[PDB]
Design a binder for this molecule. Structure first.
Ligand SMILES: NCCc1c[nH]c2ccccc12
Ligand SMILES: [Ca+2]
Length: 223
């Protein structure tokens, strides 16, 4: 997260870190046994880390739980990043508490102008590299479909939205991939892609979770 703020320990209790020997992606806990992330975060040997603030220090609220199964969206296209969503089942259920909590799926798609909270442990710089150890937050609005399409001609599908600032300076970035965009206490987006980070006229692009609720619910019901 470029241009964000330190969230504060366990203020974003649905935020997960996906760990393969190191943090590589974010995710959201949607019930005690399931995580949603980006399909571009897929790899084998995932440990889900819940209750994290500092990802390099054991602080006391963590739960570390191996993935048993990963399900990439059947229509994920790695070239276009259309359908950039995946589900991860935990080997055992998480213990839910005030610091580890699931985030609701949306009943409705959020409109342009809605203010959302984006969070992650990604890069905090738009050029060069500085990775924070503690969770970073950004408040950002959903942009109009027309702004988003103007910024990324020919690249925006009905399964994507833009959020952030056309002036630049504030965005998700490398390592934030798969993390949540939460609006009005519902998961609306997943950190998916962009042209660099925090560039002028190049806002972040997010997976539009409201299009995937039936797939998520039917997949969880049968796995
Ligand atoms: N808005 C940030 C999108 C993002 C995801 N993964 C990245 C890797 C490099 C640069 C940007 C990104
Ligand atoms: Ca920790």
């Amino acid at each position: 997260i470029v241009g964000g703020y330190t969230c504060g320990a366990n203020t974003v209790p649905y935020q997960v870190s996906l760990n393969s020997g190191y943090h590589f992606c974010g995710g959201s806990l949607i019930n005690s046994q399931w995580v949603v992330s980006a399909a571009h975060c897929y790899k084998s040997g995932i440990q889900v880390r819940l209750g994290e603030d500092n990802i390099n220090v054991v602080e006391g609220n963590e739960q570390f739980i191996s993935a048993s199964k990963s399900i990439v969206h059947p229509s994920y296209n790695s070239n276009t990043l259309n359908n950039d969503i995946m589900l991860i089942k935990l080997k055992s259920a998480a213990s839910l508490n005030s610091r580890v909590a699931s985030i609701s799926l949306p009943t409705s798609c959020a409109s342009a102008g809605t203010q959302c909270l984006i969070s992650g442990w990604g890069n905090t710089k738009s050029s060069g590299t500085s990775y924070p150890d503690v969770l970073k937050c950004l408040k950002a609005p959903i942009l109009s479909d027309s702004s988003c399409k103007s910024a990324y001609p020919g690249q925006i599908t009905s399964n994507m939205f833009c959020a952030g600032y056309l002036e630049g300076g504030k965005d998700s970035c490398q390592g934030d991939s798969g993390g949540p965009v939460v609006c009005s206490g519902k998961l609306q987006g997943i950190v998916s892609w962009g042209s660099g980070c925090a560039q002028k006229n190049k806002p972040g692009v997010y997976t539009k979770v409201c299009n995937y609720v039936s797939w998520i619910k039917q997949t969880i019901a049968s796995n």
